[PDB]
């Protein structure tokens, strides 16, 4: 519901005429919450027989 | 339980994998704790029997 659904829609529905345009905005939205650097950290080893 | 069980081993415990090290560092310790000179001390002579 991120655009042409605002005040056009009930709560409980969904605009089925825009649904392309809001699944390519969830997915931008996916994309750019992704945006980061698998940074490293402490390896170690274990002494446990698994 | 010289090396690598400290802290996650529990007092009746000891950790197979780590058999060899602990081995041998308790050798170790057994080495150092006999480097010293044989004294001579005072004598007497004997009159018992054979």
Do not use: C, E, H, W
Not at 14 to 39: D, E, G, H, W
């Amino acid at each position: 519901k991120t655009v042409l659904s605002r005040g056009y829609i009930d709560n409980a529905q969904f605009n089925p005429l825009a649904l392309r345009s809001n699944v390519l905005l969830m997915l931008l939205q996916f994309t750019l919450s992704n945006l980061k650097i698998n940074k490293s950290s402490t390896f170690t080893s274990d002494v446990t027989t698994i």
